[PDB]
A paper describes a structure:
The fold of CrataBL consists of a β-trefoil, typical for this protein family. To conclude, the sequence and three-dimensional structure of CrataBL show extensive similarity to protease inhibitors of the Kunitz-type, although the inhibitory activity is weak (in the micromolar range). A number of its biological properties have been characterized, including delay in clot formation by impairing the intrinsic pathway of coagulation cascade. In addition, CrataBL was shown to exhibit anti-inflammatory, analgesic, insecticidal, and anti-tumor activities.
The three-dimensional structure of CrataBL was determined in two crystal forms. Both of them were in space group C2 and contained two molecules in the asymmetric unit, but the unit cell parameters and crystal packing were different. Further analysis of glycosylation by mass spectrometry and protein sequence determination has shown the presence of N-linked oligosaccharides at Asn27 and Asn57. However, it is not clear whether the dimer observed in both crystal forms of CrataBL is biologically significant. Since we were not able to obtain crystals of CrataBL with a target protease such as trypsin, the location of the reactive loop may only be predicted. However, the observation that CrataBL is slowly cleaved by trypsin between serines 58 and 59, located on a loop that is involved in direct interaction with the active site residues in trypsin and other serine proteases, lends credence to this assumption.
Residue numbers in the entry:
A (entry chain B), B (entry chain A), C (entry chain B), D (entry chain A): 1 to 164
The structure:
């Protein structure tokens, strides 16, 4: 059971290489962050930075699977003027959509879902909060060597583990 | 994509409780199986027994959506004299149509289709291989406590996991 | 130093999920194997089946990096009539090139190279034994849930470890 | 792809011995650095010190091949009064052209290009930002035992690793 409002790390189902907003990797003040990607921490594999899920249905203590929710990074340090809230933006250099921070709670572009996938989970992003949704996977194109979460063809199988 | 000929578990989109033909659940020799239902494994949830999809178009290597196919259970054990092939039968002791094994390849009553259902899928059954097709859902009436697949008004949203 | 004629396991740089020719996964006699893929062993991660490198330059005891070589599976069991030797074939369902067994030593399509990539290695496949080469990576398209090695855009970072 | 502004190690395509400006290798304050060479770290092999690429076209987010760019060392320590920017100087004590730091952004002598070299890459230097460009290779003459980058007839095949 995934709990509303409680911090979890998102990890690949088969690795301990977690994820962080880019601004937190760089760890310095930024004038702005027009495209703050969520990148994988790989050398060495590190747990990353937690997130919190907020179901569209405000009344729910347990996060429903396959239902609209918001995602935001849980971090007391933050080096962007923009929000911690996840969204999706278009990018030329990454040749399409990428997950980024700097969103807005309950906006049209803010909606993701957690869905079962094999014996674990996938994230999907749902434009306008409805189908058709797009799986969230790993991309490298335009990443210059790093891996970043993006709406993809192939979902990243993930699991959630409670933070600290 | 679902590949023709390859075994997949059928699973509810939000659950880990999969499905087995009753005869395999009982695991004992049967004199006949006039109504071998596909029952859900719930206590505890278990992935069940895989199936294989065979499109009506035998050229097809990838199973298409919204086209006639057969389904059969993938199991080396089999405790009924009848086949592993899925079909639909009427049962007054279940007040209506039920999914069962014991069908025949390419027969009038053997045709199902996989369709999109929101962010995932559903199975429908197509009498004589034509529309109207009816959604396959979960029933309980006359299951002696067990839940089993049956054509009904509301579909069961499902996902597919390649076996393993 | 990678030694000519000596068996190694190819592993991803950051996982213990190795690789096997499909025919060895199935472990039964096949009438033929028109497209025997090299698939990753993931549930649970397993070391896989070794390979042997044979440099184009027959005189060499140490495998040269960035030079033409052949690859063949090292296995006393074999369930295909075709060879253990790696090559690349076109596939419709996988939407392009895939690595397969069933090749021929020193043929035009038999040539791969091991090249340094970050702190480890990549495999590339070199049509006709010359540039331009294509990185070998992981693909899923048309794999029905499995991952298979294919000429790709993005290389799989790999390491080699001596077998048993 | 190499991204403008992002740090990468330059590494020989088949080796782990990378490169550092001499002043960083010595790690001691210098009164001037008339010829701060880029020397290879060999005993043992070490990845060295990253550089950043800046295309002459400042619009460009991805570094293109065969176009004028500047290179500079990425280091917070710096022991020369001169800059981190790469250039080429004549040195009669090295019998000819050598790569050095201490250049100036966008100057006549500051232009290098990344070109394809077989299955990998090479750096060339372009006097006045035009052809003919000369290959950058490794020399040793007058290096007091050390190997250093220098324009020459034979290129050093290189690869690039994003820093880390
Ligand atoms: C379900 O029914 C099967 C009946 O065919 C069982 O297989 C049989 O198991 C016997 C006792 O272990 C064995 O003497 C028989 O040879 C075998 N019959 C066949 C055709 O294989 C099966 O038992 C399981 O599998 C066997 C091979 C052992 O591993 C047992 O420990 C298992 O219980 C029955 N399975 C279950 C889970 O009840
Ligand atoms: C290379 O030169 C640097 C000279 O600036 C060294 O940094 C200096 O290290 C001193 C002794 O540790 C320290 O008191 C100084 O504050 C510091 N200077 C500056 C500007 O940072 C450096 O020494 C290494 O780094 C320091 C911070 C410590 O970690 C030492 O243990 C290191 O040796 C010299 N580095 C090497 C590898 O020689
Ligand atoms: C990162 O940034 C914060 C705030 O600027 C600083 O206090 C902290 O020490 C930094 N370094 C590391 C290694 O976390
Ligand atoms: C929230 O969820 C409950 C139970 O699933 C439901 O009864 C209620 O109507 C939902 N509220 C909204 C606003 O969707
Ligand atoms: C069956 O599928 C093949 C491959 O897509 C197609 O070309 C062929 O026309 C189809 N046959 C029928 C009867 O629909
Ligand atoms: C696989 O196949 C071989 C030869 O047919 C057989 O002898 C072996 O026991 C098989 N099973 C396993 C689990 O390796
Ligand atoms: C094999 O390699 C050696 C050293 O690299 C070389 O001298 C020799 O000419 C090579 N032979 C062939 C046939 O390429
Ligand atoms: C620089 O690159 C941009 C983006 O590709 C291009 O559109 C522009 O025309 C280029 N400018 C010059 C001077 O080449």
């Amino acid at each position: 059971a995934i709990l509303t409002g409680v911090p979890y790390y998102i990890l690949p189902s088969t690795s301990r290489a977690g994820f962080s907003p880019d601004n937190l990797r760089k760890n310095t003040s930024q004038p702005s962050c027009p495209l703050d990607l969520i990148t994988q921490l790989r050398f060495p594999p590190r747990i990353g930075v937690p997130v919190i899920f907020t179901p569209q249905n405000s009344s729910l203590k347990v996060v429903p699977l396959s239902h609209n929710l918001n995602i935001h990074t849980c971090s007391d340090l933050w080096f962007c003027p923009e929000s911690k809230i996840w969204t999706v933006k278009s990018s030329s250099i990454h040749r399409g959509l990428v997950v980024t921070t700097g969103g807005t709670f309950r906006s049209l572009g803010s909606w993701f879902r957690i869905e079962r996938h094999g014996d674990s989970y996938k994230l999907v992003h749902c434009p306008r909060g409805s189908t058709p949704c797009r799986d969230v996977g790993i991309e490298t194109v335009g990443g210059g060597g790093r891996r970043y979460l993006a709406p993809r063809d192939r979902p990243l199988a993930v699991r959630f583990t409670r933070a600290s």
